[PDB]
Amino acid sequence: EQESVKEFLAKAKEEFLKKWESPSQNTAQLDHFDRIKTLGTGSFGRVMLVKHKETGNHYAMKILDKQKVVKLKQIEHTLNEKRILQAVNFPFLVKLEFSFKDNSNLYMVMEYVPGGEMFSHLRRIGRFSEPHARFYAAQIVLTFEYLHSLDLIYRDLKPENLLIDQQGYIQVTDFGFAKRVKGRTWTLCGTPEYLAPEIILSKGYNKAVDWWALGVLIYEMAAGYPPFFADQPIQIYEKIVSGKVRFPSHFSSDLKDLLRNLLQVDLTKRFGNLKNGVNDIKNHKWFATTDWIAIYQRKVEAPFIPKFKGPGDTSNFDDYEEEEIRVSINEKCGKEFTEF
Template sequence: MEGRPRLPSYGTTRNSEYQYGVSRDYAISSLVVPNSEHIDLSKHSTEKIIELSPNKRYAKLNCILGKGAYKVVYKALDREEGYEVAWNGCQTSKAEYMELNDEIEILKRVRHPNIINFHDCWYNNTEIVFITELMTSGTLREYIHKLQILNLKIIKRWSRQILKGLLYLHSHVPPIIHRDIKCDNIFINGAHGEVKIGDLGIAKMKKGKNYTVIGTPEFMAPEMYDEKGYSEKVDVYAFGMCLLEMVTGEYPYSECKNAAQVYKKVTSGIKPECLDKVTEPQVLDIINNCLLPENERWSVQQLLETPFLLAEPEVLLLSTNDQKNHLTMQVVFKGMDRLSVKFEFNVDTDTAEDVVNEMIEEQVIPERYQQLITSEINRILRELNKYAPGTEDGKDDSHHIWKRETAMEKELAAADDRALEAERRAFILEQQLAEKERKLENEKMIFSNSAAALVEQDIPSTQVLKKSSYNDIREELTAEEPYSFREDISNDRPIEDLVRDVCINSNRNIDKANEWIQRLKGQDIMTVGDLRELHDEDWNGLGLTVLACRLLKNTLYGKS
């Protein structure tokens, strides 16, 4: 790889002015009013199509997102799917382009929610063009500086997403090594905290040991400077440096004045000075384990299983009988790719310890959560006993018992009503669906023909994509009859229950429900309460269609 051009990067080096995943506001400010604190979007000229890809699918717009010595990134449109992408142009020769075939093949195979998508690539005269996913809020490093002080919840969420992306790369056979993990090469969709790894232009498949010295000095593991080769654990070392920057807000080895000083400290085993500023023991332990010698350094899977990065489960009381001795509880693993665990508890015959041990033996829950879940169940039992009939507290606070029973009765009644309503609407929906699908196909055909005709006439892209996607058309056709239910829905209710109700009520199959559930859980939405906490702009980042968001909102809040 030495002496050859890197593939168009997703990020920026420490001192480079080139930035790939910049936000729209940043791009406009650099083009129109670079010295102003305020950006007047109304003065921005109309975007126009200036070039089409060889297959006519991608249209480059006259909007530059970033520039470098050899690279220019434009905003572009995917005319087939109807969304914005990045058009990356990198100056190179035909011979050099042919040498990049291995890296291009890697990019084509990579598909993961926490890795920026690569769409297409071709050679055009004197440059190689890459079409990639467009991120909206710039790099993780920019975002760190924007927020200034990060809380541990944000750091935990970002770290999990970065490590999930690395785990995907390292799980390939042979593993894919990124080789340049740093906050400048990790990108953010700020509306909902989505994190994705970019700059896979120097990634390599591990075939034995790698020997090429490439990367950013402050984030390069010591073995990358040796001639003995290195493995995928160089990415773990670099992640440790990223975590250090997230916690402290400082660039690792910022005390060094040049790369030679960084090299001397790294190869001598001297850690960055800012490591002394890390006060959270669990975070410090993770960083130190990332910076260990290669043969002792933890794997990505081991990092994901550390107490700091594992989401602590929560135990919820779902229902109880009149005597308060037969309970239904649920363990919710928030932030993890697991289903919630619902179980029955008999106060007269069961103990928290016995029930938890049984779930561990049945491999329903991991053993590492034994103490936490046991204590949570005992906490719920103490709360119930406090207001149980016949106790002194229960006599004095009988209104608490009445309040809890009333809430449970309302929830059960609401569930019954939803079931009856679903059955009543099922037949009506079957008839409506056939008619709407016919309308939808007609609108889709009209939209496709209109878009193609307008592009041939070089009409501004804002007019070409007046309807941004197939889903927008579907939303218009169904907007007049949203599936709205006004019953109270508990914040503790698992998200899968809500989604399945919505899909049943809107005549969608179980596959569609599972797809929505997977997307929501991928954003750490585990309960109805998590969904209700979202702001309006956060809904756009859930990865659901406009119609799906509308159906969920109608169920939560009723028809507006």
């Protein structure tokens, strides 16, 4: 508990709270950009590569359909996402540069990270070596230390949401389930393979669900597949609440010991949620070679640099059908999104 770390987190919370209490709004508009390519797509929104017409800079624009947000009951979650993203600041979190709305849509304009998703690189290589997995895991440990000290839970850790930048480091994206929480919270949300047992059982839960998800991620990076999988979600949930996990023989003894303490079904015994907090993780034998300050300062040479030609290259993302960005002549759902 060195005073330099305590003072760092105290200042981090001061700066977050000032932006949290006075958010920015309406800092660009759609016809300031040229549309280039669809980078991914979902049930109420998509992400598109765009170019700013006056500066030439590239950005990733997240577009949400207001009517579909209402129908799928995601109003509060969408308002959480933009308010948190405009208030945070950390080396491994993606930067929000603009936000605005119009008659039909909500827009969040982020920095474009051209190296692609961790998911693509993991599946192409097969599995990551333990030093490679540990480089990425250390970045997530520091990011969760930051978020939890601001009373934020993240709730969507998985390889699809971790983007690899030009230096080989992580940028975390997608804050659609992130929330400010003083105590417990109760919403059923997340991705099935990564959910903690207390979410599945409809209990009130806390930041310990992020430390469970870190155990799932480290297992998946080091093995090539997640610890709990099956064809139907109900079958995945039965394996999770049992907590029975089998480890490949190539895992080191230190790795198995860390994973047994992160994938602990009893949340009151889980690493990250004991009296010493994150320091039970930082001081574990599996992290003995990690220089925590050098990682934060980005002074460690990364194990892998993505191949791409420049800031507008899309070769590390995949191909989707290209659809219109339509804006109605009439305003939709104006009252619901007043504060956006």
